[PDB]
């Protein structure tokens, strides 16, 4: 049994490692195949325990990762891609 205080602290609004889809983050890379197809990014997650509040980012930053791109029939190679992170989150009214 996980204690009430521990479960409460673990689920309250904060930046948690979330697996984001690259193509959702770059919807114009229609013709590319990526490996991996999703990346591990810090994003807001958790609850505010209030229906009128929402967990939102108050501090953001970018992270650079080596992603393989493959354009069928044309080329294949790894290289650097930049992604948005959330350094700080806050329960704000909806």
């Amino acid at each position, epitope marked *: 049994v996980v204690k009430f205080m521990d479960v409460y602290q673990r689920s309250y609004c904060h930046p948690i490692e979330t697996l984001v889809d690259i193509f959702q983050e770059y919807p114009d890379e229609i013709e590319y195949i990526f490996k991996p197809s999703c990346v591990p990014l810090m994003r807001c997650g958790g609850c505010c325990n209030d229906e009128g509040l929402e967990c939102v980012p108050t501090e953001e930053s970018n992270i650079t990762m080596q992603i393989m*791109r493959i354009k069928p029939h044309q080329g294949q*190679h*790894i290289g650097e891609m930049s992604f948005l992170q959330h350094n700080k989150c806050e329960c704000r009214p909806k």
Partner: antibody
Amino acid sequence: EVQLVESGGGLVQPGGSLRLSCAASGYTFTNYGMNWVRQAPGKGLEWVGWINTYTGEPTYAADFKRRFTFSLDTSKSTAYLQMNSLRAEDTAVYYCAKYPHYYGSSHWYFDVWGQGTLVTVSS
Amino acid sequence: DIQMTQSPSSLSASVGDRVTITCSASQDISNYLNWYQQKPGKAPKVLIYFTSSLHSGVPSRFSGSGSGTDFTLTISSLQPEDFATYYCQQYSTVPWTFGQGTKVEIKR
């Protein structure tokens, strides 16, 4: 140091076969595509095709689809070019070149090349 | 198959001179063009990619311009070590294709 070394060149009779090899080193072979380019004596450059070192999938310039075959042995970080039914016009220095590491966007230029091996088709 | 036509086929120029090489594509290839330098007995070496981006380790006297069907390579001040044959390559549609080359000789 990133380097590509080729071998397998030499004399081959008309109608014959030969297999060239390109041994990569100094980087992860499976992270960049591999191209094959040729240059007849005293002449220009001609792209033969390329192979995806992660999936094994090859793409040939039309004129080469019929007699050439690209393959790879990742356990040896080597790419191969098998040529069949050779004619005198096939005589040339054959090169292998890897695709580059990108930044932001993709551009298909060849960045590290092998030294090239001369293949001479003669009886 | 896009066809690339380089001009001139060969030129001779003195050290310190500005040299410009031309390239014309048979159809619009946008800015998908690279330039290579090949010396005697060696493999080609990339100088510029994506019309005008200088590859790392290449001297600033080398520059590229253009778009569509017309491109240009420029050596602002020719040096003796610049003797070579220069080639253009398009990466707009497969198969990739090169120009026939321009042989640059140094006049002394």
